[PDB]
């Protein structure tokens, strides 16, 4: 689809068998989701945003469907203010910016 | 143009007679720029993201050019690690997400 930006580009995602709402965030390198239970091993990592750094759990090679488009990649879980879909997954679904 | 997301979507902007680099950021409600000494009045604001909040100065009706596309609107100035063009200006240049 073509998504205008008068509102937040929020979409439904499916991860670990659960539906969620997430923000398509071209300013995020990585995908960061709010605290949740996820199947798989993980590794503690640090990620930095506009306000500093937070501790997250890194899940690699996770299946995640974004607005009907399938992706498989890294998902960071931790105290992010909102679920964000970053460029690591936006590229997988073929997302570009256009003006 | 069309911008792929393999790398950060950095573009040149012109603001306050200065050229800078900034991210086209669909996850940013507002536009937040590195510290710069803009003239005129301003109002304090706090904006939150990963890591917490930062204090910024809100300037209204600022003229910005983004890839030769002119816009005018609110710009927040503060100690942000990166310049981000938010949806308040992205809508003005006709920017969409497409997949
Ligand atoms: C609440 C939704 C987002 C987290 C909001 N952020 C825009 C993001 O695009 C941000 C923009 C950004 C980009 C680089 C450094 C700091 C902030 N990217 C980000 O935090 O990404 C992190 C996750 O991937 C990693 O790659 C980049 C940092 C990591 S933000 O910078 O904090 C932000 C921008 C304008 C705003 C605002 C918050 O409140 C209202 O106006």
UniProtKB/Swiss-Prot annotation, chains A, B:
- Active-site residue numbers: 25 (for protease activity)
Q: Where is this region: Dimerization of protease?
A: 1-5, 49-55, 88-99
Q: Where is the Peptidase A2 domain?
A: 20-89
Q: Which residues form the signal peptide?
A: none
Query: Highest taxon of the source?
Result: Viruses
Q: How does it assemble?
A: Homodimer, whose active site consists of two apposed aspartic acid residues.
What's the protein name? Protease
């Amino acid at each position: 689809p073509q998504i205008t930006l008068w509102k937040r580009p929020l979409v439904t995602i499916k991860i670990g068998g659960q539906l969620k709402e997430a923000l398509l965030d071209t300013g995020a390198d990585d995908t960061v989701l709010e605290e949740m239970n996820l199947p798989g091993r993980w590794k503690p990592k640090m990620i930095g945003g506009i306000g500093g750094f937070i501790k997250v759990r890194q899940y690699d090679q996770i299946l995640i469907e974004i607005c009907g488009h399938k992706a498989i990649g890294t998902v960071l879980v931790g105290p992010t203010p909102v679920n964000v879909i970053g460029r690591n997954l936006l590229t997988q679904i073929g997302c570009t910016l256009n003006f």
